[PDB]
Amino acid sequence: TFGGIPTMLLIDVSCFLFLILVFSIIRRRFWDYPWLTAIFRLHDDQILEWCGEDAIHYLSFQRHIIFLLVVVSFLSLCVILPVNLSGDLLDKDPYSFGRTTIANLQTDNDLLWLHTIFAVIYLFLTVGFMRHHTQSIKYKEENLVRRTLFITGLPRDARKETVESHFRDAYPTCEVVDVQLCYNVAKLIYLCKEKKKTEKSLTDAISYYTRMKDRLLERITEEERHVQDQPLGMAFVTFQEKSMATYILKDFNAGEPQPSSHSRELYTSKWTVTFAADPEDICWKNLSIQGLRWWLQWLGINFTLFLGLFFLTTPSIILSTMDKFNVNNPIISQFFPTLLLWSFSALLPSIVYYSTLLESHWTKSGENQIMMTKVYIFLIFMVLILPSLGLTSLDFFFRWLIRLECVFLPDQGAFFVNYVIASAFIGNGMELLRLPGLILYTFRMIMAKTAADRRNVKQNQAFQYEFGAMYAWMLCVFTVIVAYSITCPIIAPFGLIYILLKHMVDRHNLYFVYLPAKLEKGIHFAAVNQALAAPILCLFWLYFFSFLRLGMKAPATLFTFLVLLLTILV
């Protein structure tokens, strides 16, 4: 049986090959734009010219992940796998997964220390490999900002004269004479005047409309006359020189600044002063939501999305643990739950995107970095910790149906190995095919006048990329691989296969279908900072399983906990 790995691998290989055949037969017929030679022949200068330097840095990260996974796969299958194989605890049948996982090790054995040593070795290895990528990634500048001064919490009675005459003494200089008219411009920012574009379309209805146009024309004036009497206390002070603002935030953060005549009138000790962002990316529509209402919105959205995760992961856990409940057909209960979990995980990023849009952050630059961070965090709570916490709780409940000496995941780590394989062959084939994108493209071709189309749609089908989403997905699967790199070491070569396939597919996509991208280096740097979380999470799960099996009185847990504490501290 080998924990269903052979059958799962066969199914995934067949599915990936079928998806590749489908791509081979539809790529030119439908989208109208082989490709394996392109993947294996496109040098790194072409992918520099075609598609921006962002692609170069992304493939550099991918290549570093390839090499890191190669090293950990060798260092796993060569040493930590024989260590697990030399055990008489879980079982003795070679056709099983417990024979290779950590569960095949005595609670009194001396090789769990080797497990922990290899965990810290992998942590240092990942740190070095990501440091190399950070060295490769240059161009960390343009933090220069002179405008800045996004003061918040200002009382609504700001007449601009009080604030200017007070910044005359406290914060010397300040010849901007503009700061309060940046209140909550929400209703005034409609973008609903797109009905003017539909007015050119002229819609039976025949023409209709023009009444929405008249009403939205009256309202963009009612709001334009209502902007001044909507003071939410938001301030922008676009300075002339940069050294001014430097010494200025130094003086404000040095706290009573130099007194002014109007300081008492303004209550200047209660303000919040921070550097501002470029006026283009400031979301005046979301600037209305401020103070406690913003945090209540964040809490509500986070709670609703976490309940969504609890309702999305649970079906997969029950289906995977269904057969052991008695204490099943191999084609199902291994492939079906893993596929269901992968489908829900693929559906997750759109949910996170709409959730953040509802959350209404203030900065557009903080709407992509936070976007990718949120997607990665929810993917962790979606495929890695929650299914593992859920499965283990069921298994510990199954044991009670207690010898803690053998308490592991149901069918060991075979669930996560099958998940990695699914994200490797079938998942990667689906992502290459872009089935939802193709369905939307065909629906857009159909749903029209079928007279003037077939000339458009083809050009506007292409969108640059989702560097944040791709980093989040790759990092989620990479964390799944790394967290089980030592524990259940069989997953390392399968993770290597996954990452090689992902590199090939993205190497194809970033030249052949997707438009060039100009994302900020912050996304890449936060992805690098995300990669260092995988060994930390791996060592945390090593500690968690060691604690579950053998008590804290054991030196293995007495040492792994202190190592984890030091690693978290650093």
Side-chain angles (χ1 to χ4, degrees), residues 1-94 96-130 132-145 147-155 157-167 170-177 179-180 182-186 188-195 198-223 225-241 243-247 249 251-257 259-263 265-269 271-277 279 281-284 286-324 326-402 404-448 450-454 456-463 465-517 519-551 554-557 559-570:
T1 80
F2 196 49
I5 302 301
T7 80
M8 192 46 207
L9 242 187
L10 178 62
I11 293 169
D12 289 5
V13 159
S14 85
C15 288
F16 169 70
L17 261 185
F18 159 77
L19 286 154
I20 287 326
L21 168 60
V22 169
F23 200 69
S24 269
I25 70 141
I26 294 169
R27 182 182 65 198
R28 186 198 39 256
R29 313 211 211 286
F30 282 52
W31 297 30
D32 223 21
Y33 74 100
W35 79 99
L36 258 171
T37 67
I39 298 157
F40 299 151
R41 191 161 318 290
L42 171 162
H43 26 65
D44 221 33
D45 308 13
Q46 218 278 357
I47 213 175
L48 204 139
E49 177 198 339
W50 284 58
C51 209
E53 265 284 348
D54 289 345
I56 287 273
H57 308 309
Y58 173 84
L59 295 174
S60 170
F61 180 73
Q62 282 231 23
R63 268 161 161 143
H64 276 94
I65 292 286
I66 307 293
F67 296 147
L68 166 61
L69 274 202
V70 175
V71 179
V72 308
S73 77
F74 174 91
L75 186 42
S76 154
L77 299 168
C78 289
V79 72
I80 177 49
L81 178 56
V83 164
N84 283 331
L85 284 176
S86 88
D88 320 330
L89 195 142
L90 201 287
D91 68 306
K92 293 179 179 179
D93 183 359
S96 64
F97 218 48
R99 191 81 192 174
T100 78
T101 59
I102 173 182
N104 198 30
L105 222 54
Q106 274 77 252
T107 46
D108 68 45
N109 221 335
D110 57 316
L111 283 316
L112 310 97
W113 284 271
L114 196 43
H115 281 249
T116 69
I117 279 150
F118 284 147
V120 315
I121 286 294
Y122 290 171
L123 168 66
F124 290 150
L125 196 67
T126 298
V127 154
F129 267 107
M130 281 327 102
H132 199 299
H133 182 46
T134 300
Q135 269 189 40
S136 175
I137 276 180
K138 321 257 184 327
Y139 187 70
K140 262 323 294 170
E141 311 90 6
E142 280 82 17
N143 304 126
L144 57 92
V145 278
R147 160 168 194 277
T148 85
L149 262 280
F150 181 26
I151 315 148
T152 42
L154 217 175
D157 52 326
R159 205 179 329 100
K160 143 65 47 190
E161 311 166 20
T162 312
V163 56
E164 211 54 65
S165 47
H166 145 85
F167 285 163
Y171 265 36
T173 73
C174 202
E175 191 50 61
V176 183
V177 290
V179 88
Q180 183 64 300
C182 315
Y183 9 64
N184 53 317
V185 190
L188 177 63
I189 300 186
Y190 263 129
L191 307 170
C192 264
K193 200 81 161 292
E194 43 200 7
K195 293 179 179 179
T198 89
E199 200 49 68
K200 146 74 209 84
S201 176
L202 298 131
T203 298
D204 63 298
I206 305 178
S207 176
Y208 263 26
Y209 277 118
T210 75
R211 73 163 209 279
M212 263 319 96
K213 211 206 87 58
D214 289 351
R215 280 314 78 61
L216 278 181
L217 177 63
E218 156 274 299
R219 282 138 49 98
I220 49 165
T221 67
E222 149 179 304
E223 307 304 321
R225 85 157 185 65
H226 265 285
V227 283
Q228 58 279 29
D229 289 345
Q230 269 317 297
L232 297 198
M234 302 265 178
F236 286 101
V237 194
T238 305
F239 290 97
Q240 185 185 55
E241 294 190 357
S243 55
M244 338 162 85
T246 308
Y247 150 70
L249 191 71
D251 182 52
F252 177 80
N253 284 134
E256 283 195 347
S260 80
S261 56
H262 288 272
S263 290
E265 186 182 352
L266 273 172
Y267 317 164
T268 67
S269 59
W271 300 21
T272 308
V273 181
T274 49
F275 288 138
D281 60 48
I282 305 289
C283 323
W284 271 271
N286 318 325
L287 269 199
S288 53
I289 308 182
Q290 88 147 344
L292 190 71
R293 180 208 190 157
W294 186 24
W295 281 125
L296 167 72
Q297 288 325 292
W298 157 77
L299 185 73
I301 294 298
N302 155 262
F303 191 80
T304 279
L305 206 31
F306 210 32
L307 254 292
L309 295 196
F310 270 70
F311 273 20
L312 283 202
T313 64
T314 315
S316 83
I317 299 162
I318 306 160
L319 293 158
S320 70
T321 207
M322 203 57 135
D323 53 274
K324 298 95 179 192
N326 204 36
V327 56
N328 211 357
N329 161 239
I331 311 167
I332 61 183
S333 98
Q334 265 307 330
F335 176 58
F336 178 46
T338 293
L339 190 70
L340 185 129
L341 206 156
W342 194 90
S343 92
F344 285 165
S345 168
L347 157 68
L348 195 76
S350 89
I351 314 165
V352 190
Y353 175 49
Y354 312 140
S355 93
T356 298
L357 291 193
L358 290 178
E359 251 205 303
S360 77
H361 291 81
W362 286 353
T363 307
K364 208 96 72 183
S365 325
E367 276 257 346
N368 323 324
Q369 173 49 54
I370 277 285
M371 171 37 49
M372 150 191 104
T373 278
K374 201 180 236 277
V375 174
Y376 163 78
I377 285 292
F378 277 136
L379 274 180
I380 287 314
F381 274 131
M382 172 66 157
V383 317
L384 190 39
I385 294 169
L386 201 34
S388 202
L389 283 197
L391 272 167
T392 306
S393 314
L394 267 302
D395 198 279
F396 200 71
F397 156 72
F398 283 161
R399 260 307 164 175
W400 178 88
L401 277 199
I402 300 159
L404 293 120
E405 159 201 27
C406 52
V407 168
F408 204 43
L409 271 64
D411 59 82
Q412 269 48 244
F415 184 64
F416 284 71
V417 181
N418 298 311
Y419 179 71
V420 155
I421 296 169
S423 180
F425 292 105
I426 294 169
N428 241 4
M430 191 75 38
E431 182 295 310
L432 182 41
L433 188 46
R434 303 181 280 293
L435 204 44
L438 167 70
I439 277 304
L440 204 33
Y441 173 80
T442 44
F443 283 179
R444 207 190 338 263
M445 172 295 297
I446 297 152
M447 210 56 227
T450 194
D453 289 345
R454 287 100 30 89
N456 304 337
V457 174
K458 215 197 313 293
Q459 292 100 55
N460 50 71
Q461 179 48 51
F463 50 97
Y465 214 169
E466 293 177 350
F467 271 55
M470 292 334 305
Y471 274 143
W473 193 270
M474 174 178 332
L475 264 281
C476 183
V477 192
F478 173 71
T479 48
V480 168
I481 302 148
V482 165
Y484 293 62
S485 178
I486 293 107
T487 289
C488 173
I490 312 278
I491 210 179
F494 293 129
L496 174 58
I497 291 316
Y498 157 72
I499 205 64
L500 268 163
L501 266 279
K502 184 70 175 176
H503 190 278
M504 278 162 201
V505 159
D506 264 8
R507 214 191 201 300
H508 156 85
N509 266 4
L510 265 162
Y511 151 71
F512 225 120
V513 175
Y514 274 10
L515 280 186
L519 263 302
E520 61 255 47
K521 313 290 177 119
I523 309 301
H524 315 304
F525 273 104
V528 173
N529 217 12
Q530 209 154 94
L532 307 184
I536 291 296
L537 194 139
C538 178
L539 205 149
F540 162 65
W541 280 93
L542 193 56
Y543 161 69
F544 162 83
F545 288 128
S546 76
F547 167 72
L548 268 195
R549 296 182 66 192
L550 177 63
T557 49
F559 157 80
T560 280
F561 188 77
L562 64 87
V563 152
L564 180 60
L565 181 62
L566 297 172
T567 56
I568 286 167
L569 183 62
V570 171

